[PDB]
Amino acid sequence: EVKPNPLQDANLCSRVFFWWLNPLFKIGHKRRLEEDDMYSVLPEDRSQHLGEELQGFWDKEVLRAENDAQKPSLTRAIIKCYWKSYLVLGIFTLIEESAKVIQPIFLGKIINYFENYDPMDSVALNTAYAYATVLTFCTLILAILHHLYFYHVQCAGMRLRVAMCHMIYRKALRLSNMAMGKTTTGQIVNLLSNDVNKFDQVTVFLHFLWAGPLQAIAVTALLWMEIGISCLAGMAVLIILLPLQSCFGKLFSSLRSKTATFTDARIRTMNEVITGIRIIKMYAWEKSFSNLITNLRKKEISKILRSSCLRGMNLASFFSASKIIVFVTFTTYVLLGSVITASRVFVAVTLYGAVRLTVTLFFPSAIERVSEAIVSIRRIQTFLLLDEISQRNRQLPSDGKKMVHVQDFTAFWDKASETPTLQGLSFTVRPGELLAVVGPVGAGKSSLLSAVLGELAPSHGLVSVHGRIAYVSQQPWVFSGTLRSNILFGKKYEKERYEKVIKACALKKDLQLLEDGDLTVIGDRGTTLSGGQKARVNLARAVYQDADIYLLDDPLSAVDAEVSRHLFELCICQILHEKITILVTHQLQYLKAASQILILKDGKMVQKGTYTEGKVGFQAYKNYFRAGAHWIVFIFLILLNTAAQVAYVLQDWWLSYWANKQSMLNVTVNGGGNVTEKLDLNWYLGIYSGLTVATVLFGIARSLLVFYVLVNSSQTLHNKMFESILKAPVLFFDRNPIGRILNRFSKDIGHLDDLLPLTFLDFIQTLLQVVGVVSVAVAVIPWIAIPLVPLGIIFIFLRRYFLETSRDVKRLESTTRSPVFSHLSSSLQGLWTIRAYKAEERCQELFDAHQDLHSEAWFLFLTTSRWFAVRLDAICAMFVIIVAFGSLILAKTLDAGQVGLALSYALTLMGMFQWCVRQSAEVENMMISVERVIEYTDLEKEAPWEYQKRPPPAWPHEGVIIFDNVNFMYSPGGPLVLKHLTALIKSQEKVGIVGRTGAGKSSLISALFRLSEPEGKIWIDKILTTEIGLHDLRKKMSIIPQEPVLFTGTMRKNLDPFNEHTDEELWNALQEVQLKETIEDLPGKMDTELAESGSNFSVGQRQLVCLARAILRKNQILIIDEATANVDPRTDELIQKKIREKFAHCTVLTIAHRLNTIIDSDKIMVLDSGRLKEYDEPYVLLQNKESLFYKMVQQLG
Ligand SMILES: C[C@@H]1CC[C@@]2(OC1)O[C@H]1C[C@H]3[C@@H]4CC=C5C[C@@H](OCCC(CO)CO)CC[C@]5(C)[C@H]4CC[C@]3(C)[C@H]1[C@@H]2C
Ligand SMILES: C[C@@H]1CC[C@@]2(OC1)O[C@H]1C[C@H]3[C@@H]4CC=C5C[C@@H](OCCC(CO)CO)CC[C@]5(C)[C@H]4CC[C@]3(C)[C@H]1[C@@H]2C
Ligand SMILES: C[C@@H]1CC[C@@]2(OC1)O[C@H]1C[C@H]3[C@@H]4CC=C5C[C@@H](OCCC(CO)CO)CC[C@]5(C)[C@H]4CC[C@]3(C)[C@H]1[C@@H]2C
Ligand SMILES: C[C@@H]1CC[C@@]2(OC1)O[C@H]1C[C@H]3[C@@H]4CC=C5C[C@@H](OCCC(CO)CO)CC[C@]5(C)[C@H]4CC[C@]3(C)[C@H]1[C@@H]2C
Ligand SMILES: C[C@@H]1CC[C@@]2(OC1)O[C@H]1C[C@H]3[C@@H]4CC=C5C[C@@H](OCCC(CO)CO)CC[C@]5(C)[C@H]4CC[C@]3(C)[C@H]1[C@@H]2C
Ligand SMILES: C[C@@H]1CC[C@@]2(OC1)O[C@H]1C[C@H]3[C@@H]4CC=C5C[C@@H](OCCC(CO)CO)CC[C@]5(C)[C@H]4CC[C@]3(C)[C@H]1[C@@H]2C
Ligand SMILES: C[C@@H]1CC[C@@]2(OC1)O[C@H]1C[C@H]3[C@@H]4CC=C5C[C@@H](OCCC(CO)CO)CC[C@]5(C)[C@H]4CC[C@]3(C)[C@H]1[C@@H]2C
Ligand SMILES: C[C@@H]1CC[C@@]2(OC1)O[C@H]1C[C@H]3[C@@H]4CC=C5C[C@@H](OCCC(CO)CO)CC[C@]5(C)[C@H]4CC[C@]3(C)[C@H]1[C@@H]2C
Ligand SMILES: Nc1ncnc2c1ncn2[C@@H]1O[C@H](COP(=O)(O)OP(=O)(O)NP(=O)(O)O)[C@@H](O)[C@H]1O
Ligand SMILES: CCCCCCCCCCCCCCCC(=O)O
């Protein structure tokens, strides 16, 4: 019933033109696409079939290698599998290359006809028409057959990829444990993600490995047959283009490295900025972080400027290579005494363009892709050859075999380690007896769990595992999918047993709270689940399996204790009355009701024992370029672009003019050929050389200027955004995840620094080239303007009618790439249960289904891309037809030069248009980074850091803070946390504030700190908080928070980032915190490097450095926010003593809920309804004659 692939019933014509894809677009144009408008993968392309056939090939290869005692080669298997299906595409590649080379010959023939133009000779006209028809027939063959063949090549690559992914998943299912000892799940996921991806690219260019050279050779021959030895010179510089380009890349690569580290450091520091944004804000350390990040950004910007200059030079050289080659070869041609003509020059130009495109783009990319594919295949081969677990012997006919006995088996997980890790495995569990092994984390519990051939193949001893085994992992796991699949695990829909097990597990309430029930799919990354639910579903799966050996492992620990007891009573006593029920227990009641007890000692046990014993508008472009540079520079840049394109075209135009003038000179010299007037080679050669030099210079200048202005725009935008976010209020950080901001600062800026300038420059270059070709065609033949207007218009519509669909399918592809990997990870996470249930084929089928869906997405993406390419290339071919045939129509008003030039540029148009449209789409969809960047640059700010009031230095003279009608309001439009606060705090008063749990306390401290908006009256030392700049209040305000976060870098910055305190004071402070000896032994000393967030430093040391910073602040009044809430008692008491004596002169405010912190405080503010009607002291009510103090006194002492 699933919609079959329409390609199955499509004829040859529809397949060539991708006509059958039309309905999908008609759907896509109307509504957003989904996975139900999909197309099923062809039956021969399903993951299972490719996996099976490649497994057969690989096994045959391995057997052959073992026969002759050789190392098996994965590449040999791949070749032996796919050479038959690839040689046909190679043959077609030969055909396409032959057509591409042969087209310029007919171009020369038609130009020759134009050269010998006799209007009366109709036979010449007919021959010219035939040559034009052959030329356009070859052009059409290229135009459409190339796209069909490209789709088939990409499909072959996708087939290789899907087969390799199936291979990897199957091996991972059979993969061993010394693999986990050596490799990690991350490595396997990386193999499945990146290493296999290369196979989807190499096959694109693989045939060029033989097509590239051969074609070039043929081209060379052709060129000789037209211009002789001169051609060699041109080829020479083309060959010179190969190593130097590579050389550039090497330097580029080096520069890339020197950027990345800086960038990494940059982002790392900024992570510490975003993660501890509140800490930085209340510490007034924004300036130091800003300076550090600015230095890092400046170094990175210098490096990327160098890299972009090199890249622009390379791009301009690639763009001007054709002009360089043509100029060199025809200069050598001219000084060799030969005379130029339009036919020969334009034949040489076209051949040189084609062979240069091939050699400089397809061949190097082909070589690089082949090398990458070889590397990935080597890695996959190493993974496959990795040893797997010995195949567990198939369960022999259980002739009353439900008895397990291990006779003092001794083996270790790491047999290399001769230490007796696991030994004395001597036990016997009979049918119906449950061995509730007990012991406090006695090393060896996993072995008892792994007693059913986990990793304990009997080296010396006996193992009698017989029957079906149900196993529960230490961490219960569920794969992505519906619950029904987990419960069944391939068993039949036994509805009676299903309802019995679902009611036995007491999952009815879970289903009721669940929005859909047993049909519910696993939530996003398993978020909508809990450990208790996972344990319950694992138990339900095991009980529904109805195996013989029920091997459990702490299933009832995860679920609540009482519910665990209900499940034990309902299941173990009744359901598991007659089962093999070995279970490791941590609760006494479980082994109290056990049938067999076992006290386990490390290694050998002591004894058995008994229990008793998104479309970006023009505004984005305008803002981006305005941030770029002044509009005068923009005008200069567009003028430079126009000049570069004009010179590029006028070089060939001057060649044509030379040819035409020489033709007229030859006509004149034919009558009376005795003077033999020679055209002045000095004048023409000098003009030609000047034109090509101007082309090179303008191309280089334009590339460099575009790169410079775009990188400057990126730098300015980054600086503006950083300044904006550093001035953003905390509410913005609360309303946005840290990961989101880090992603915006990392990926978008990386785009704007690496890809956006390159892509924009390439798009501008190729668009200018296309406009140049169109303008040449129009200028040579004005009438071509008449049919050009509809054509382009059609294109525009086509673009829309494609883009509105393409994005959708692109999205689909992404949304189907993620699940596959996850399944593998899940298959790796719960692999133990998979081997326990002998259900490897089920997970294999699940993986095949997932990856078949992904193959549907890939097939749709490939097909829609090819459809758009076919239509637009048909537009190009129609344009070429128009140019050539209109030229033949108006042959009475044209010369050789202009027709040659126009036809050559029309021939060039195709690939240029392809690249221009693709680059335009890339730029458009990739400017969303710029749009988000701009949105970030225009977020709401707060009060300026520095005001103009400038309160006098040492402003907290007495620290008399007065509150008057403080109605704090947290978030605009949100709830009002605090109202009418009139606290009257005097100088040198230790107030142990308390109330409203922790939310009200946090609101109060934020309001006091001006961190939020303090709606109320605050006289901090008789000065309003409003009339003080933010930073000015921030500095002289000491606070020790609950979280002592540390920043990577040097110690000295951590104690003093602004570096205004002499080292002796730092040593005195370190002595006060009793850490002088701790830093003295550190090799880095004051310049000590710190691990990620001070990992090596302990939490006690973190609070120590925090209170050392507080000491260095020397602020008269201090805030303490739950310093010793969950810290070790030794650190608790040392910190308490530090506050007691080292802060005996400061008006501290202890904002914490801890009893010890508040008892010492002389004053505690009592608030009821915000109005203190009873003007008294707490001491008259501290003797439990109130409500709250009664609670603390009774409960907590
Ligand atoms: C990539 C490089 C581009 C430049 C270059 O190498 C390859 O291109 C080659 C062409 C060679 C010349 C070809 C023919 C003649 C024959 C004779 O003069 C004509 C006599 C006349 C009688 O009727 C014809 O037979 C004298 C020698 C001369 C001029 C050659 C000299 C070397 C030249 C210039 C070579 C030069 C170094
Ligand atoms: C990538 C590389 C860039 C450099 C380069 O190759 C390709 O560019 C080529 C240009 C060649 C010269 C062109 C013309 C002639 C004249 C000829 O005789 C003329 C005599 C007299 C009456 O005929 C003239 O009025 C002798 C040979 C000479 C000087 C060539 C030498 C090789 C040169 C320098 C080649 C050089 C190695
Ligand atoms: C900043 C921008 C730089 C480019 C540009 O704008 C400004 O500068 C302009 C100069 C123009 C050229 C001036 C002279 C001629 C010669 C003539 O050829 C007749 C041959 C024969 C016929 O009988 C004579 O007897 C016509 C063509 C050509 C090359 C012009 C082409 C267009 C050009 C390149 C314009 C171009 C748009
Ligand atoms: C943008 C770039 C700069 C301009 C340019 O390239 C593009 O545009 C081209 C226009 C060309 C000229 C057009 C017409 C004539 C015909 C005839 O006029 C003899 C007059 C003389 C004797 O009677 C009077 O004393 C001789 C040739 C001449 C002047 C051309 C020369 C080359 C020129 C200047 C080219 C020049 C390099
Ligand atoms: C942007 C870059 C600036 C430098 C540059 O590239 C572009 O600018 C180009 C201009 C070229 C000259 C143009 C005209 C002539 C006159 C000719 O003789 C005339 C004789 C008689 C007419 O028949 C006089 O009435 C001899 C050659 C010469 C001087 C050219 C030499 C090369 C030059 C200098 C080129 C140079 C490499
Ligand atoms: C945005 C882009 C800026 C650059 C650019 O595109 C747009 O601006 C265009 C101006 C074009 C020239 C205009 C006129 C002519 C004369 C004509 O020759 C005789 C014609 C007729 C006489 O009877 C029939 O033969 C053909 C050649 C030439 C020089 C054009 C060359 C291409 C040029 C340089 C184009 C160039 C690529
Ligand atoms: C980017 C844009 C692409 C299009 C375009 O701009 C740039 O490219 C320019 C080239 C121009 C042509 C150059 C030479 C001539 C020869 C002249 O000879 C008159 C002889 C006699 C009989 O008419 C007079 O009575 C007639 C006019 C013509 C064909 C021009 C037409 C306009 C054209 C097509 C321009 C057009 C607007
Ligand atoms: C070279 C090839 C020629 C044929 C073709 O590919 C390229 O050209 C494409 C253009 C597409 C149409 C664009 C817009 C509309 C919108 C809406 O109707 C609006 C009607 C209204 C417009 O002014 C008044 O008429 C319904 C869909 C429709 C007609 C598209 C249908 C598919 C078409 C015909 C495509 C077709 C396969
Ligand atoms: N992968 C392994 N590599 C080496 N030794 C292993 C491995 N797995 C198990 N062992 C051996 O078995 C012990 C496993 O520790 P153990 O405390 O039994 O884990 P557990 O069964 O997960 N216990 P718990 O999670 O506390 O209920 C090790 O200390 C080794 O003696
Ligand atoms: C002359 C060749 C131009 C090719 C470069 C692409 C030009 C695109 C012109 C249309 C701009 C976008 C119009 C709306 C469609 C969209 O949202 O992409």
Ligand SMILES: [Mg+2]
């Ligand atoms: Mg254990």
